[PDB]
């Protein structure tokens with residue numbers, strides 16, 4: 093009976109195994125655009141994915157991860173609210189069963205069809221495992237997805253999902269360029285938070301872009317064909333793998349734009 097997104101193991105149950113679920117800096121949160129304040133101390137955000145090296149794609153039973161080789165400083169995120177260099181290690185999405193839900197963060201309570209999470213770890217901590225044990229160990233770039241025009245750069249991902257339909261399945265996924273998943277603008281909101289799934293560690297500096305990318309209905313439909321279950325088990329469609337907004341508590345969401 094391990095955690096999941098169902099009625100008996102979903103988000104409202106996570107606190108029993110992971111008490112931090114009711115912590116002081118949990119994610120995701122609702123972003124109140126009118127309360128978020130422009131922060132002049134924020135430095136220009138730097139997203140350098142030109143030398144990114146993807147290696148494989150995995151269905152871990154909660155979502156699917158496109159993993160990158162982070163043994164060297166290649167695809168990095170810096171600037172903005174960040175101090176130091178954060179290395180890209182993987183990206184994944186959270187989506188819904190319907191176009192009107194799926195995102196973890198919400199903007200003025202509005203839910204998007206999905207949300208992309210590009211995960212990076214602070215290099216001063218040596219490795220990803222050590223980084224997650226630090227308040228400023230990770231930096232996750234969140235990008236909303238809305239249904240409309242197809243996103244050309246996402247099709248490569250969409251077409252390989254049939255090969256990793258069930259939990260535990262992985263497939264080679266080299267030479268995928270994450271720059272093809274970024275919107276035009278880098279305007280963003282930032283706040284201190286946590287991982288959005290167990291163990292819910294409060295080690296993340298969240299940077300959520302204001303501009304969403306558009307993906308086609310067909311593209312998101314394929315996301316919904318994935319399975320939460322492993323091969324040979326009753327089919328449980330991988331949909332609604334998002335955690336709802338959590339209490340903001342003693343935090344302020346800062347905006348990079350005036």
Ligand SMILES: COc1cc2c(cc1OS(N)(=O)=O)CC[C@@H]1[C@@H]2CC[C@]2(C)[C@@H](CC#N)CC[C@@H]12
Nearest residue numbers: 209211220221224232286287288289290291293
């Ligand atoms: C930032 O990316 C994630 C990392 C992890 C999880 C979920 C994540 O998605 S999210 N929405 O971006 O928070 C869930 C499982 C976690 C893992 C991070 C590394 C952890 C803490 C392992 C420890 C190491 N290394 C144990 C469980 C792992």
Ligand SMILES: [Zn+2]
Nearest residue numbers: 184186209288
């Ligand atoms: Zn995530």
